[PDB]
Amino acid sequence: GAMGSMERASLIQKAKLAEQAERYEDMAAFMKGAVEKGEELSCEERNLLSVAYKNVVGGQRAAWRVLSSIEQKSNEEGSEEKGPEVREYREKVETELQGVCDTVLGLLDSHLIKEAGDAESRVFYLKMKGDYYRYLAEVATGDDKKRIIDSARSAYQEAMDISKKEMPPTNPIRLGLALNFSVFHYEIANSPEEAISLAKTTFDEAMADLHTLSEDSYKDSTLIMQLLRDNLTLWT
C-alpha cells in the first residue's frame, strides 16, 4: 500500500541501497512494493526479495530463541516466579515473526507462484514457501501445527519434484532446496535419517556433475555442497 506511489524501478534501486546499508526491514518493504506492482520478478529481483526477508525473519528467529530459552528456564523446578512478562514478550516477538511469514506467504500466493512457469523461478518460490511454513512450524504449539508442518513438506516436495526433472544436480537452486528440505526433515519432521540420506545423495550426485561446469559455476555449486557436508558432519 505505502509503496503504491513509487516506481517499480525505484523500489528495486532502493532495495539495493537498503542492502548496502544493512537496512533489511526497509529492503523487504521495498521488495514487497515491487512484487505488488504485479509483474514477474527477474532472477536478480527474486534474490533481493529472498535476501531481505531471510535477514528480517532470521533476526526474529534468533530473538525468539533467546526469549524461549529464558521462558523454559523460568518453568524449571526452583525457578522464582517472575510474572507474565517473559511469556508476553516472547509472544510479542512470535506474533511479529508470524506476521512476516504471513506477508511472504501472501506474496507467493498472490501471485508469484501461479505466474512462475520456468523451473528456476517456480522452484525458487516453492522453496521460499517451504521455508516460511518451516519458520511458522518452529514456533507452532497448537491445533494447526501438523497442518503447518505438512504445508512446508508439500511445498518442498513440489519444488523437489520439479528440480529433479528440470535442473542439473549441481544447480544452486536445486542444491539450496535440498539443503533446506534436509534441515526440515531433521529439525521439524523428526526424521534425521531422511535428512542425512537427502544431504548425502544430493552431495554425491552434485559431485559427479561438477566436471560439466565452468570455474564460476563450480565455485557456486561447491559452496552449497560444503554446507551439505557441514550439516552431515553436525549430524553424524
Binding site: 539450496g176 539443503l179 534441515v183 552449497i224 554446507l227 557441514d230 550439516n231
Partner: peptide, 5 residues
C-alpha cells in the same frame, strides 16, 4: 544450528 540458504 544447521546451515540453510
Amino acid at each position: 544450528f544447521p546451515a540453510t540458504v
